[PDB]
Amino acid sequence: HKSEIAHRFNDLGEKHFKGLVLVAFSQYLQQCPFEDHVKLVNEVTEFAKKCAADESAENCDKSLHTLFGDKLCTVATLRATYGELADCCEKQEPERNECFLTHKDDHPNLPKLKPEPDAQCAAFQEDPDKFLGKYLYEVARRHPYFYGPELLFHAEEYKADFTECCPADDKLACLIPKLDALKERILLSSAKERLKCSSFQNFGERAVKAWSVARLSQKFPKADFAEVSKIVTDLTKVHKECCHGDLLECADDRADLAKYICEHQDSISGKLKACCDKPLLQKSHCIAEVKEDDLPSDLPALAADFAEDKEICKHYKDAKDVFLGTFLYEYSRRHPDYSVSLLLRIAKTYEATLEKCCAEADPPACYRTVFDQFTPLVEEPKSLVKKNCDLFEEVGEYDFQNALIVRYTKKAPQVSTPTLVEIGRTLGKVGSRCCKLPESERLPCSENHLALALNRLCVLHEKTPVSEKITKCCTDSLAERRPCFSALELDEGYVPKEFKAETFTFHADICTLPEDEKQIKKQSALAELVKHKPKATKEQLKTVLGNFSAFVAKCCGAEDKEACFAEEGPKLVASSQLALA
Ligand SMILES: [Zn+2]
Ligand SMILES: [Zn+2]
Ligand SMILES: [Zn+2]
Ligand SMILES: [Zn+2]
Ligand SMILES: [Zn+2]
Ligand SMILES: [Zn+2]
Ligand SMILES: [Zn+2]
Ligand SMILES: [Zn+2]
Ligand SMILES: [Zn+2]
Ligand SMILES: [Zn+2]
Ligand SMILES: [Zn+2]
Ligand SMILES: [Zn+2]
Ligand SMILES: [Zn+2]
């Protein structure tokens, strides 16, 4: 194509082109006001239209990196607001784009988005385009690795919620539960895509493919290995591009891949029919989220090919990545009841069994028992999920979250209290989600969502590193992460954090807060208690936290709340230390 920007504009259309370019700028420049971005978008777009009319015009030849980075580097008050990015603007491409990518704030600490139904419905009716763009801007800067097409799709859900509810009698009751549901989806989708980008960053393209082979084989058991391989090759390209802010290319290739999948849907899965009769944005999303197809009646026995064949060693040497990819494909497609990382551990164990056995004097006799080496790998996560769901059903979300905050603070007492609380709470929502699913779907749900939660912890740990053990578990192996974390215990020689009475003192300001924020305040204190008394048993900690709870509930119900906290607080702070020895 003579002009790549003209080509993307022609392919994607103005609405989505502008949308994606807005997302892209918002993610790189997280602090800038909405009006600054709208003009960068409007200027780039006008250029695209000029180029679409004449591809031979001056500068239309330039790459997208060149044109997008030049526009970023023109922003007012760059050196003041984005010091790191100004440095990047000295560089030529592709070094410039590589600099930009190195500098992206995952946790910018911007204010929490609260829906205001009257004000927003008013802004929606006066100017929908401005209102919908605002939502794209706010989510993009809050989540810098969110995939453009995914966000544009969710921007339309957000529009449909406002279209439906704003004319109605009760605006809040129609809208609040819908927007809360959309937020739930934004969070998970953001976490899934962040895990893909982190996999590229920490482990590379090979590991993302292996993850994709495993996951798509489970989703599409009817598809043959060539079809899975095809989709994985293309999907990995889409993901690398989106992760890298190349949102025009990502959007365009994503749409071509959905086209191919739907063209070949009879061969890939019977569950795609629902996805393939929709518009382009809706279709990519449905495919990405499609439920698993039923198992084929003609799945082949694996023993003959992967355990019994006497030429395996030659097979392993002469065609390594194709023999392993095929194994992973076969094992994964017949195990929708396994998690992705467990499948990856199984594949790693298969590979390692071959290296060991094929150096030995009599290989067939060694690798004959290779499938029996997988048994302990399956049982370990099955026990964890049964055990955690048992606790969750007994004690409920709040107490389950408290148990995990204790567990994880004991593993990583150097990690910040906000982070420890955030992870413990996220891991507790895993119980809510997964333990109520059908029993055969618990293990995949649990482990896969655990993996998302642990990857969040790792992304934070890249920014603020406090623990060598966390560094190893985050950076040694993608497959081994969750079991590396589960194996962590309290350091023998971690020095307890010095006691601060003010950390465990509560006040009347808590009483007015919503339930979740009250919980966060008490769960924060729980974490601190562990940090001061790391050797305290979880049962001591449960009791002590319960006294703080009974104390907060009492003084918040008092006639004089400040007097109650002032009187009853210090004694509980003193006695609590003695109960945790
Ligand atoms: Zn092109
Ligand atoms: Zn589109
Ligand atoms: Zn500015
Ligand atoms: Zn958000
Ligand atoms: Zn989604
Ligand atoms: Zn990358
Ligand atoms: Zn790029
Ligand atoms: Zn994807
Ligand atoms: Zn053979
Ligand atoms: Zn179960
Ligand atoms: Zn799930
Ligand atoms: Zn307070
Ligand atoms: Zn409460």
Mention every residue, 6+ apart, whose C-beta is less than 8 A from residue 85. 28, 29, 72, 78, 100, 103
Reduce the secondary structure of 9-41 to three states and give it as a string. HHHHCHHHHHHHHHHHHHHHCCCCCHHHHHHHH
CA distance 357 to 313: 8
| Contact predicate 269/223, CB 8 Å | yes
183 Cα to the center of ligand 4, angstroms: 7
The one-letter amino acid at 21 = V
Give me the DSSP letters along 310-346: TTHHHHHHHTHHHHHHHHHHHHHHT-TTS-HHHHHHH
Q: Last residue of a domain, which of 351, 379, 407?
A: 379
The Cα angle at residue 29 between residues 23 and 30, in degrees rounded to 5: 85
Chain-centroid distance, C-alpha 389: 22
The answer on 14 and 86 residing in a single domain is yes
The answer on 501 and 487 residing in a single domain is no
Give me the DSSP letters along 121-180: HHHHHH-HHHHHHHHHHHHHHH-TT--HHHHHHHHHHHHHHHHHHTTSS-HHHHHHHHHH
| Contact predicate 306/370, CB 8 Å | yes
| Contact predicate 441/449, CB 8 Å | no
Within-domain flag for 423: yes
At 538, list the tokens: 């979880």
The answer on 76 and 20 residing in a single domain is yes
The answer on 131 and 187 residing in a single domain is yes
CA distance 472 to 484: 8
65 annotated as a binding-site residue: yes
Which domain, by its residues, includes 325? Answer: 294-379
Within-domain flag for 580: no
- Specify the CATH number for the domain of residue 143: 1.10.246.10
435 Cα to the center of ligand 10, angstroms: 8
Query: Residue 113: left (phi > 0), alpha (psi -120 to 50), or beta?
Result: beta
Tell me the backbone φ, ψ of residue 382, rounded to 5 degrees. Answer: -60, -45
246 annotated as a binding-site residue: yes
The answer on 188 and 114 residing in a single domain is yes
507 annotated as a binding-site residue: no
Burial class (CB in 10 A: 0-12, 13-18, 19+), 558: middle
Using the structure block, give the residue that is written with the tokens 């279209």.
Answer: 163
CA distance 210 to 351: 13
How many residues appear in the chain? 581
Using the structure block, give the residue that is written with the tokens 């899975």.
Answer: 228
Residue spans of alpha helices (H) in 360-416: 363-367, 375-411
If we measure between CA atoms, which residue out of 286, 233, 298 comes closest to residue 258? 286
If we measure between CA atoms, which residue out of 334, 353, 352 comes closest to residue 343? 334
CA distance 60 to 47: 8
The answer on 334 and 427 residing in a single domain is no
Q: Which residues surround ligand 7, an ion (CB under 5 A)?
A: 244, 246
Torsion of CA 383, 387, 388, 392, to 10 degrees: 150
CA distance 265 to 284: 13
Within-domain flag for 579: no
Within-domain flag for 313: yes
Torsion of CA 212, 214, 216, 221, to 10 degrees: 160
Within-domain flag for 576: no
Reduce the secondary structure of 205-247 to three states and give it as a string. HHHHHHHHHHHHHHHCCCCCHHHHHHHHHHHHHHHHHHHCCCH
Q: What is the resolution of this structure in A?
A: 2.4
Q: Last residue of a domain, which of 431, 459, 491?
A: 491
Within 10 angstroms of residue 244's Cβ, the number of other Cβ atoms is 18
Sign of CA dihedral 104, 110, 112, 117: negative
The answer on 121 and 61 residing in a single domain is no
285 Cα to the center of ligand 5, angstroms: 6
| Contact predicate 100/28, CB 8 Å | yes
Q: Last residue of a domain, which of 448, 470, 491?
A: 491
Query: Residue 59: left (phi > 0), alpha (psi -120 to 50), or beta?
Result: left
C-alpha to C-alpha distances, 47 to 43, 53, 133, 334, nearest whole angstrom: 6, 10, 20, 51
The answer on 227 and 137 residing in a single domain is no
CA distance 245 to 334: 35
CA distance 522 to 399: 11
193 annotated as a binding-site residue: no
The one-letter amino acid at 67 = L
Q: Which helix (H) or strand (E) holds 561?
A: helix 561-579
Q: Which residues surround ligand 3, an ion (CB under 5 A)?
A: 36, 76-77
C-alpha to C-alpha distances, 372 to 40, 377, 384, nearest whole angstrom: 59, 10, 20
If we measure between CA atoms, which residue out of 390, 382, 424, 419 comes closest to residue 407? 424
| Contact predicate 344/479, CB 8 Å | yes
Within-domain flag for 237: yes
The answer on 509 and 463 residing in a single domain is no
The answer on 456 and 446 residing in a single domain is yes
456 Cα to the center of ligand 4, angstroms: 13
Within 10 angstroms of residue 277's Cβ, the number of other Cβ atoms is 11
Among the bound ligands, the one closest to the CA of 518: 13
372 annotated as a binding-site residue: no
Q: Which helix (H) or strand (E) holds 196?
A: helix 171-202
453 Cα to the center of ligand 11, angstroms: 12
- N-term to C-term CA, the chain: 72
**Structure obtained using:** X-ray
333 Cα to the center of ligand 10, angstroms: 21
Domains identified in the chain, total number: 6
If we measure between CA atoms, which residue out of 142, 149, 151 comes closest to residue 30? 142
Using the structure block, give the residue that is written with the tokens 């944005």.
Answer: 281
CA distance 67 to 455: 33
The answer on 127 and 88 residing in a single domain is no
Within 10 angstroms of residue 551's Cβ, the number of other Cβ atoms is 19
CA distance 382 to 446: 10
If we measure between CA atoms, which residue out of 381, 502, 391, 496 comes closest to residue 442? 381
The answer on 171 and 238 residing in a single domain is no
Within-domain flag for 574: no
- Quote the crossing angle between the two packed helices 14-28 and 128-142, to the nearest 10°: 40
At 414, list the tokens: 């150097």
263 annotated as a binding-site residue: no
| Contact predicate 34/133, CB 8 Å | yes
129 annotated as a binding-site residue: no
CA distance 407 to 424: 9
Among the bound ligands, the one closest to the CA of 5: 1
- Peptide bond preceding 438 in cis form (omega within 30 of 0): no
4 annotated as a binding-site residue: yes
Which CB contacts under 8 angstroms, 24+ apart, belong to 491-495? 491/413, 494/413, 494/414, 494/534
74 Cα to the center of ligand 8, angstroms: 32
Within-domain flag for 575: no
If we measure between CA atoms, which residue out of 40, 43, 34 comes closest to residue 138? 34
If we measure between CA atoms, which residue out of 145, 124, 239, 237 comes closest to residue 194? 145
